[PDB]
Design a protein around this ligand. Structure first.
Ligand SMILES: Cc1ncc(COP(=O)(O)O)c(C/N=C(\C=C\OCCN)C(=O)O)c1O
Ligand SMILES: Cc1ncc(COP(=O)(O)O)c(C/N=C(\C=C\OCCN)C(=O)O)c1O
Ligand SMILES: Cc1ncc(COP(=O)(O)O)c(C/N=C(\C=C\OCCN)C(=O)O)c1O
Ligand SMILES: Cc1ncc(COP(=O)(O)O)c(C/N=C(\C=C\OCCN)C(=O)O)c1O
Lengths: 391, 391, 392, 392
C-alpha cells in the first residue's frame, strides 16, 4: 500500500478544492473576516489554521500532512534546504554546556556546523564510528543532549545498527534527543520513528523533489519533540516557499516508481563493479560484504540509487581529468536523488579530513555515483569506457 | 536616478540572456564540464560562479547584485523570510559570553529570538529606548557585540537618531557590529550603510515583493562584515528559492512608483486623522510632532505607507468587534507593504508587554494602518465610517 | 469607487483568495466531481464559473475573468495565449464563408496578415479604411460586412479614431455588424470601448496589464449580445491561458493605476521636448495637440499611456541608423511595450507604406517608436539628446 | 541509446540548461537585440531557434521542441495551449474552402465537433470511417480529400487501426493527402507515427507527457514536408504555450519510461482480472487478446499505457449508476487521464452511439473507462470488486 499512500497523502479537498494537486496559496498576509475569526486563528496558529505566511498556507499544510502520514510523525517542520533542517533541528534542543555526539560519517557541513557554530556557543561535539553499535555508551556523557545519526553515511555509505544504538542511549541518557539524517532512504525505505528515533531529517532536495530543481528540508518529529522543534525553528524564521512545498508534494507521487528503478539499476551496476578488475571495493548497502549490509538487510525495505566504489589505484591529476572529463552519461555535479546520473571523485586524504576521531581504510580514489533513470546498460557501457581510459 | 537604478539593477545579459528579466534557473545540482571547471567553480563558489544550489543560481546572483547596488553594500545574503534574516544575522556574530543591545521597539519576534534562544546559549540581551541618542553609552558593556536598531520602530514608529547612536557606539565599542532592520524604508528611503551601519536587514517580504505573496529576507553588508555573515549563514543552510528571488527582483522595478503613492496617501490620511475628534495621537514619521520626526526629516528621503494612531478611548471587546469587523476597504491581516490596505488594533497592555525596560505612554487603543494603492479618498471615507461606528 | 480602488479589489472575492490577498493558483486539467449529482451540476454550469475542466478554467481564471468584466464593464471575458490569438480567434468566431471584414489600415500588422492570409482562403474578404474616415466609413460598408475592426490609437503611427462617429455611421447602415476594437494602448481602462457601443474590446494583456514584459495573454471582454458565441467558438478552437499567467495578470492590475499615471506624465514631457527639437519633423502622441485625432482623444479618453512615435526631419541611411540605435544606454531595442523599461524601434517610410493598405502615409523621414517606461524622465531625455547628436 | 537514456537527456544541451540539470525557465515577451546586426540576424532566424520574440518562443520552448523532435523523430514540433488546440489548429493549417476531411468515427469528440461546427461554415466537408476499415478506406476517399485523421486507439472504445494498411491505401489514391494522427494514448513513444508514413503526430501532452494532471499543452511533431506550413499558419493564429508549461513537460519526459511500464503492467493485470469477471461483458484493452485491433497493437506498438474500458453485462439505471460511482475510494471521477491517480468514467450505449458517426456500436451494457494510475494494483482491484458488489 505504499504506492497508494504516496499517491494520496495530503490530498484532502480542503487543500485541493476540486483539483488533483493542492492549490498554490502564495501569501504573507492572511485576512481575518472578524475579530472573532482573528482570535480563533491566533489560538490555532500552530494547528493548521490560516494565520500568517511564516507559519504557512494551505499548500504547506498539505505537504506537512503528507510527510506525517508517510513517516508516522506527530508533526513536520519545513526548512529552506536539508542543511538548514540539520543545523536548526540541532539548535532547537541545545543549550550552553550541552554535548552533541555525532557519527563521523555525517555530511560534512553538518560536522562544520557543530565545530564552527556550536563551539562558540559553549556546546561541545565529539564523534563516533558508524559501526560502534551498543558500545556507543563509551561516548555518552551526563550532559549528552543530542545523538546524531546518518545511515547510510555520506560518501562511504556505512549503515548503523540503529536498534542497538538506540537501546544503549535510552539506558544511559533517556532524555537525549536522537536524530537521524534519513535522506538516502527518502524517509520511506527506513522508518526512523518506528525505531525509537525522535526526529527524522531529510534534504527533501534529493529524492522527494526528484528532479534537481528545488531545495527544501523536512523534520518529522515524534510527539515528544515536535513542539520545541516547531516553535524554536519558528523563532529562527525557518520556512519554505509555497511553490517548493507544492513541488515537493508533487515529487512524492512518483516516489515509488522512481525508487524501484534506482534500486534495480544501482544494484546491477554495483554487482558489475564488484567483479571488475580495477575496482578494489564497492560500498553499496544492498551489496553483500558492504559495511553494515546486515543491518540494511534487516532494517530497510529497499535501496535508493546513491553509492560509491574505491579504485585499486589512486589517480593522479592527469588520470583524474582524463577519467572524469570524458564521460558521456554521468555528469559531474553535487547533490543527487534526481533522474540524471552523477559522478564525483574523492581522494583518500579528502575523506580522512572529514572523518573526525576515526580512521580511513582505503588507499585508492573513491568514486561516488548516483544512478539515475537512464538505461542501466548504457550507464555500464559508459563506466567500462571510463575504466579503459585509466587502464 | 533612483527610478533608473531600480529598473536596471542586476539586469546584466549574463542573467537575462536576452530577456528583460533574469532567467529562472531552478537547481540543486550544477554540472561541471571538467575537473578544471570544477576546481575553478570551487575556488569561486562564493564569488558568483555556479557551484551548488545552496550557494545560488544565476537568478540569485542577479538579485544579490541588485541589492548591493541599491543599498551600496559589499555583498547580500538571502534568507527564507525577514525573521530568518534577523535571527541568523545576529547568530553569525555572537559567541557565548557576548551581550546584545537591542531597541525596545524591535519587532516582537526579534526580541523573542534574543530572550528565548540566545539566552540558553550564554548570550545576554538588554534593551534601550529608541530616542536615547548619544546616551546609549550608558547601556554599552565591554562585551557588547551587537547593537540592533529598528527605525521607525515596529507598531509605535519612533525614529532613532542613527548618527548620534553610531558615534557613541564607535567611541566606546569600536568592534561592535551595528545592525538595523531597515524594512519600513525598503532599504532605499534610508541608506543605512551610509550612516556607518554594518548590516542593513529587510523583510523583503514587505515593499520589495510588494504584493503579499512571497517571503524573503535580505542582509546587505559592508566589506567588514560580509564574509562572516555569508559563511555562517551558509553553515545554517540559509538560502531562498530561485522563484522568490526572481519575484523579488521583479518587485524592485515598480518600487519607486509604489512608494511615492504610499507616501502621498499615508501622509494625507495621517493629517486627516491628526485633526479628527476621536484621535489622541498620530504616529507617522513624516508627520510633525511624531517621535523622532526631526530625524526622519533630516535622514530619510521619503516615507512608505505604514503608521499607527491612538484613539482617545480604549475600546472594549464589543466596540472592537463593531469597529474592526465592518470595514469595507481595510483588511485585518498581518504583514504589510502590499497593494491592499490593512488594519490591526493593539491594546495598551499588549504593547506594554513588548516594550522591555521601557514604559508605554498612551492609554487608548492603538490602530496600525498600512495604506495601500486604493483611492485615498475611499480609504478616508471608510475610516470616517469606522469612527461613526464607535461614536 | 474610483479606478484605483477598483483596480486593487477587482476579482478578489474570498471564494478565489481563500483567506489570502491574491487569488489562489489552482493548476489543473482534471477537476474532480464528488458524485454523479455534483458532476451533473458542474456540466450544466461548465460555462458559468463552476469547476468542470481545466480547458474551461479553474478558480484562478474565474478571478481574472471577473476582474476584467468589472473593469471594462462587459458581460463576459474570454482568455487567449496572447494578444494575436485574441484578435485572430475573436474574428474567426463570428465569420462564415462569404462575409466581409472591414478593418482599419493602421491595425497591428499581424492582425492584417491574419485577414489576408488565413481569412482569404476560407472565402472571407477584407478591405481597409483610413483611421480618420469618421462618419464617411459608410462608403466602405457592404451588405455582407460582418465585422468592423477598430484600433485606436493605431499601431506605430498613433492616429485616434472618432469612434462615436464611426459607431453611429455603421449602426445606421448595418445594425447587426459586430464592431470590435484592439484597445491595448488604453489598457481597456483609459477608453471604455463597451460604453461607446463597441461589441468586443480586445487587449494584448501582454502589454500594460502584465506590465513587466514577462507573460503573454490576450483578453476579449464582450457585451451580452456577443458573449456566448465568442466564448463557445473560441472554446472549440481550444483557446485558453495557463493559471499562472492568469494570476500574474490579475496581479498586474493592482499597480496599473500608479504605473499608467507615470507613463502618461513621463511620455508627455518627452513628447513636448521632442516637438520643440530641431531634428524632429513631427511627434505622433495622442495627448499632444496637432497630433492626428487629438481632439477625439481629449474628448473620449481619460488618460494616456507611454507609447508614441515621432518622425525625424531626415530619412536615415544604414550607417546612420546603426550609429543612432546601437549607442543608446537607457532605451533597449525590442518588440512589444507596456512594461517598466523604455524601448525604441525605428521604421523607414517604405516599411510603413508597405503596411498601410488602401492608404497613403503622410511622412518621409525615419519614424521612431518609443515606449516610455518608469525610468527618470530627465535621464531618458538625456539619452535621446545624445542620440540626436550622433545623427548631426 | 535506448528509450530511457533518450528520455533522460532529450533537449538538455548546455545552451538551454546553462550549467543546471533542467533547462532554464526564460519568461518573456520582449527579447532584446544588442544591435541592428543582431536584430537582423534574429529576424532571419526567427523560426530556427534564435531568440526573436516570445510568441515564437524562448530558450525553454526550444529545449522542449528539440526533445519532442528527437523522441518522435520529426523535423519540427509545434506547441499549443492544450490538446484540443493542437487538433483544431493542425487541421485548420492545411484546409481551404472546398476541401474534404476524412476522420475516424472513434475520434475524440471535440475533434469531431470542431469539424462539424467550425469547419462546416468555412466550406469544408467531413465524413467518417470505421477504425477497422483498413485498406477499404479507399471507398471513402474523394478527389478533394485533403486530410485523413487517425486516432489509434480510439477514444473511449479503444479500437486499434491497421495503420500500415490505411496509409498504403490512401497513398495509392491520394499521394498528397496530409495524414494526421492523435497519438496521445501511446504518448508518441509507444507507436512511432512518423515511421509509418504519417505526416503529423499530435498529442495532448496534457496526459502522459505532463503525467501529473496539472498542466495543459498540445504538441504536433511534423515531417519535413509539413513543418513550415503547420508552423507558420499556427503562428498566424497566435498559437503558443507558456515557458513554465514547456519546462514542466520537458520535466515530465524524464520519468515517462518508468511511469509507462507501471501503467502497462498494472492496467494489464486489471484487464485480465476484469475479463474473467462474471459481471463484465467485454474488456476493451489493446494489449488484451480478442480486443479490437489487438494483433495490430501487438505488431505495431512497443508497449501499452494505462487507459482502457470495459462493458458491464448490464445497462445500469440511474440509482445503480450513482450507487456504483459514488462509493469508490481509490478511483476518482474526473475527465482526462495520464496522471498518477486512477480515474473512472461511465458511458451509456446511447451516449457512445450518439458520437459514432456513420457507424454502429457493438455493445448494449454500460461502458466504464478506467485510467490505471500508480497506486498498488491489488488495492485498485479491491476497490473495483467492491463496486461490483454494489451492483449485484
Ligand atoms: C545526506 C545529506 N543530508 C543533508 C544534505 C544537505 O541538503 P541541502 O542543503 O543541499 O538541501 C545533503 C546534500 N548533499 C550534497 C550536496 C553538496 O553540495 C555541495 C556543497 N556542500 C551532496 O553532494 O552530497 C546530503 O547529502
Ligand atoms: C520590521 C519587520 N521586520 C521583520 C519582520 C519579519 O519578516 P517575515 O519573517 O514575516 O518576512 C517583520 C514582519 N512583520 C509582521 C508580520 C507579522 O506576522 C504575524 C506573526 N508574527 C507584521 O505584521 O508587522 C517586520 O514588520
Ligand atoms: C496593439 C497590439 N495588439 C496586439 C498585439 C499582439 O499581442 P501579443 O501577441 O504580442 O500578445 C500587439 C503586439 N505588438 C508588438 C509585438 C510584436 O513583435 C512580434 C512581431 N509582430 C509590438 O512590437 O508592437 C500590439 O501592439
Ligand atoms: C485522445 C485525446 N486527444 C485530445 C484531447 C484533448 O486534450 P486537452 O485539450 O484536454 O489537452 C483529449 C482530452 N480528453 C479528455 C478530457 C476532456 O474533458 C473535457 C470534455 N471533453 C478525456 O476525458 O478523455 C484526449 O483524450
Amino acid at each position: 500500500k505504499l504506492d497508494t499512500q504516496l499517491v494520496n497523502a495530503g490530498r484532502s479537498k480542503k487543500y485541493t478544492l476540486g483539483a488533483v494537486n493542492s492549490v498554490i496559496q502564495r501569501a504573507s498576509s492572511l485576512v481575518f473576516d472578524s475579530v472573532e475569526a482573528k482570535k480563533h486563528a491566533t489560538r490555532n496558529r500552530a494547528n493548521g489554521e490560516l494565520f500568517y505566511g511564516r507559519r504557512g498556507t494551505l499548500t504547506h499544510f498539505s505537504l506537512q500532512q503528507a510527510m506525517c502520514e508517510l513517516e508516522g510523525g506527530a508533526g513536520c517542520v519545513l526548512f529552506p534546504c536539508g542543511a538548514a533542517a540539520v543545523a536548526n533541528s540541532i539548535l532547537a534542543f541545545i543549550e550552553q554546556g550541552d554535548h552533541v555526539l555525532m557519527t563521523n560519517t555525517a555530511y560534512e557541513p553538518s560536522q562544520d556546523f557543530c565545530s564552527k557554530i556550536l563551539s562558540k556557543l559553549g556546546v561541545t561535539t565529539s564523534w563516533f564510528d558508524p559501526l560502534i553499535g551498543a558500545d556507543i555508551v563509551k561516548h555518552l556523557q551526563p550532559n549528552t543532549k543530542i545523538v546524531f545519526l546518518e545511515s547510510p553515511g555520506s560518501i562511504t555509505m556505512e549503515v548503523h545498527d540503529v536498534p542497538a544504538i538506540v537501546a544503549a542511549v535510552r539506558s544511559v541518557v533517556p532524555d537525549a534527543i536522537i536524530m537521524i539524517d534519513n535522506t538516502w532512504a527518502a524517509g520511506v525505505l527506513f522508518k526512523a520513528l518506528d525505531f525509537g528515533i525522535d526526529v527524522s531529517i531529510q534534504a527533501a532536495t534529493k529524492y522527494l523533489v526528484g528532479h534537481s530543481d528545488a531545495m527544501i528540508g523536512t523534520a518529522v518529529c515524534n510527539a515528544r519533540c515536535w513542539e520545541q522543534l516547531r516553535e524554536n525553528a519558528y523563532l529562527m524564521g525557518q520556512m519554505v516557499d509555497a511553490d517548493t512545498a507544492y513541488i515537493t508534494s508533487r515529487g512524492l507521487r512518483t516516489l515509488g516508481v522512481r525508487l524501484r528503478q534506482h534500486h534495480e539499476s544501482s544494484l546491477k551496476v554495483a554487482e558489475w563493479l564488484a567483479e571488475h578488475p580495477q575496482v578494489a571495493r564497492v560500498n553499496h548497502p544492498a551489496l553483500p560484504g558492504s559495511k553494515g549490509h546486515e543491518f540494511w538487510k534487516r532494517d530497510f525495505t529497499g535501496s535508493s540509487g546513491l553509492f560509491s566504489f574505491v579504485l585499486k589505484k589512486k589517480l593522479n591529476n592527469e588520470e583524474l581529468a582524463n577519467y572524469l572529463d570524458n564521460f558521456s552519461l554521468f555528469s559531474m555535479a553535487y547533490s543527487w536523488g534526481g533522474y540524471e546520473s552523477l559522478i564525483l571523485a574523492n581522494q583518500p586524504e579528502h575523506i580522512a579530513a572529514i572523518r573526525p576521531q576515526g580512521e580511513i581504510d582505503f588507499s585508492g580514489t573513491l568514486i561516488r555515483l548516483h544512478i539515475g533513470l537512464e538505461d542501466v546498460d548504457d550507464l555500464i557501457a559508459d563506466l567500462d569506457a571510463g575504466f579503459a581510459r585509466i587502464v
